[model samples]
Target: GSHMLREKSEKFAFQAEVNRMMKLIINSLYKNKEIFLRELISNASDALDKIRLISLTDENALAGNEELTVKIKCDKEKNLLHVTDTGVGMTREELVKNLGTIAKSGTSEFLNKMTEAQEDGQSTSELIGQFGVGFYSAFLVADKVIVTSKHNNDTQHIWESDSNEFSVIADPRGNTLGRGTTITLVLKEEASDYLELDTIKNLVKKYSQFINFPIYVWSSKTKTVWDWELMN
Candidate 1:
C-alpha cells in the first residue's frame, strides 16, 4: 500500500476579535491591575495541581521538580516582574492555543459552572479550573509578555507578545525549569506599583489565601543567623 502523505499546516493566527477583547481586558476588566500577581499565583496553583495528579499515577511524577512552589521576582531597575512555578507546563502548540486565543479557556468555564452551581446552593471548595481572562490581565501592566515553559513531553519554548499579536519560538536556554512555566512581565511606566514588596505580599494574601501551595517573594535582604541586635 502506498503511504498517504499530507503537508503540515502552519500555525493558525488569532481571530480578529481578539484585539477588541484584549483592549476591553486591558482597559476595563482589570481595575486594580496589581491583581495581576494574584492571577499569576492562582495559575501557579493550578499547575501544581496538574503535577500532583500525575504523581498519583506515577510516583516519580515530581521526580525532578519536587519543590512544587511558586516564586516571584521583581526587578525594579529593569521594570520586570517574573512569576514562576514548578508545575505542569505548555508545549509550543499548547502555548499558542492557550495564550494566543480568547474565550477558549477550559479553566474559566469550569470556574463559571462551579460558581453557578454554588449560587444555586451547591457546596464546593474554592474551584480551580479554567481561570478565564487571568492571563490577559498581564497586559494591564506589561507592554510585553514573555512566557518560558518546559513540559514533560516537549522541549522548552518561549511565547512572546505585545498584545497585538504573539510569536512562539524554540527556547535556546534549554530547560531551566524541570517542569512548569515562568511568566515575565515588562512593566509599563504607569503601572509601576507592582515593584513594591508590600504590595506583592498583600495581593497574594488577599486573593490566594486558600491556595494549597506555598508562594515565595524573592528579595535580597542580608541577615545573620545569630544577630540579636536586629531581632525584634
Candidate 2:
C-alpha cells in the first residue's frame, strides 16, 4: 500500500512586469478608489457572459449554478469585501496564468500600455479592461486577496495574494461555488467605507446598473434576518 496523495498548494512569483504593474496601480493609477467596485462588477459580468455563451453549446455549463448573477457581501466586523459571480470559473492553470502573468505577449507590453496611458493623462479606468488587468485593481483597496473558483472542467481551487506574490491550491472545502468564482478582499483600514451597504449599492448603481446579469448585495432589514437585495 502506497498512498501519499495530498491537497498540495503551489506558490508563485508574479512575472516581473506584473509586479511592477501592481505597484503602479496601488500607489498611483487610480485617482478615485471607488472605481474598484465598478471594475470588479464589470469583471463579474464578463465572467457571466462567458458562461452563458458556453451554455449555448453545452447545456451542462450552467448545471451547477443555474442563476447567472453577481453577489456582493461585506463583513464589517472582519473588514472583508466579497464579490462573487456565477460564471465560467477558472481551471487551476488558468488561475495561475491569468492572475500571475501578463497577457499572451509574455512581455512588458501590458505594463507599457498602462504606463503610456498614465503618461498621456488618460484615465486609467478606461484601460482596465483593455489589458485584462481590471482585476488587479483590487490592490487599490485591499492588502490581501483570496479567490476561490470552481469550474465544470476542474475541481475547486483557491488563489490568494497580498500584492507581492500569489499562491494557488486545491480547495479542501470542496466546490463551495458549485460553478463560479468568489473574490474576497481583506480591505485596508482606510478602505473600510467600501464595507458599508450604501457605498456598495451606490457604486454598483453608478457604474454597472446596465450590466446584463443581476447584481445582488447581502442586506439586512432587521437584526435577526438578512437577504440578497437586488441592486439593479
Candidate 3:
C-alpha cells in the first residue's frame, strides 16, 4: 500500500491524485469483494490441515476446540459479519509481526507511512481501508477488522487495526476456541450486500466453497449447518 498521506493527516485540497492512487490499492487487495469469501476459506482450511497433521504425533493437539470446521455469521441488526474456524490459531508475536509489521518499520514509526489518514481525520470510508495484503482483505467491506485467535501453546489474543496503526490485547474470553481463529467484520454500507443470507449462500457455493471442512452460515431457515458432536 502506498502512503496516501504525506503527513499524519492531510486535508483534501489539491491532493486528488493521492486519494486516487489510494483507490488503486483497494482494487488490488480484494480485486473483487466477492473474492473475500474464497481467500478466507482457503486460509481456514490451511489452519485445519496443519493442526490435523500435528494431532497425529500429539493426541492432545486439538485440546482447544477438537472441532475442525468453519462457521460464518451475518447480523443485519448489528451490521456485522463473522467468519470463524476451529483450526490452528496464532500467538501474540505472530499476530503483531504478520498483521502490524510494526517491528521492522522501513523508517520511523509514523514516518514509515508516507502519510497517516485516520490521525489527520481523512476518512478511509471511501477507500474501504484498501488493505488486503493478507487478513487485510476484510477491509474491502469493513471499516474495522477484529481477529480473535487461540494457539495450541498460547492463550487467545485479539488483534485489531483499521489501517494506520493497530493494537493487540489479550482476549478476555480466555481459551474458548481450543485451537482456532475467528474473524469479525463491520460491513461497509455499499459492501452490505454481502450480509444477505441468500447472497452469502450463493457466494460460498460459487467462489468460496469449503474445501474439506463444513461451512455453516447462520440461516434462518436451515437453523443448523453442521452438528460437530454428531458428525465430526
Candidate 4:
C-alpha cells in the first residue's frame, strides 16, 4: 500500500493554454493594466473564503494562522510588490495543478470563452474568474512572479514563473508564513509605479474597498520607521 504513493516532481511546464493565456494578458487582452491588482486581490479573497468555510467543520483548520486578512507591501529598492493573505494555502500538488494549468476550466474551453466574450464586447475582467485564470494576470506587470504558499497539511512551497514556464519546489527557507500565501511580483521597469505605497493604497480603496477582510499596506512613516497602514 505504501508503494502506491508516487514521488512528486518539483518542476513543471505551464499548460499549453496557460502559456497562450499569459501572452494574451501580457500583450493585449486587458486595457487597464492596473486590473492585475484587482484580480490578485480577488484571488486572495477567494482563498480566505475557502479557509473560513473549512474552519467551520474542523476546529484545527485555523491553527496555522487565525488572522484572516490581506497584507500588501512594496520594496521600492528591490522593485517588488508582495500581496500576502491568511487563507487556505495550496499543497505542492495543488500548486502545480492550479498554477501550471488552467484548473477549473479546460484550456481550450477557456480560450474559446474569452474570444466569444471579446466579440460580444463583454468586460474581460468579469470573465477572469469564470475561467479560473485570474492568477496569471500577475504577468501584466511583473517580469517574474514568486509565490510562497503554506498549507496546514504540507510543508511550505515556492512557485515561480516568468509567463513562459513555472516551477515549484519545497521552500528551503522553511515556514516563514505560518499559513496562507504570499505572492511577490518582481516589477518590470514600466510597472515600478506599483512600488509606491500611495498607489497601492488608492488601488485597494478603489477596487477592493468592499472586501470583507481588512487590507494592510506596509508604509514608511519616516526615514527610520515603517508601519502597516490599513487600507480597507
Root-mean-square deviation (CA) per prediction? 7.6, 2.6, 10.6, 3.7
The local lDDT score (0 to 100) that residue 162 gets in candidate 1 is 84
Compared with the true structure, all predictions reach lDDT values of 0.72, 0.85, 0.66, 0.84
| Candidate 1 segments whose C-alpha is farther than 4 A from its true place | 1-12, 103-131, 222-232
lDDT of 1: 0.72
Q: Of 2 and 3, which scores higher on lDDT?
A: 2
TM-score of 2: 0.91
What is the TM-score ranking, best to worst?
A: 2, 4, 1, 3
Candidate 1 lDDT, 119-168, residue by residue in tens? 57543222322335567778889999999998887998888888766778
Per-residue lDDT of 1-232 in model 4, one digit per residue for the tens?
3332244355578878778777666554557789888888989999999999999998999898879999998999989999999999999888888888765537677677677767776667767766767787888888999999999999999999887677888898998899999999999899988998789989977767878888888888755788888888
Residues 153-185 of candidate 2 have per-residue lDDT tens digits of 999999999977888988989978999999999
Listed in order, each prediction's TM-score against the native is: 0.77, 0.91, 0.70, 0.90
Error of 3 at 68 (Å): 0.6
What tens digits encode model 3's per-residue C-alpha lDDT throughout 44-117?
77778888888899988877676788888888889988888888789987776666542232323323232354
What is the Cα-based TM-score of model 4? 0.90
Best by lDDT: 2
- lDDT ranking, high to low: 2, 4, 1, 3
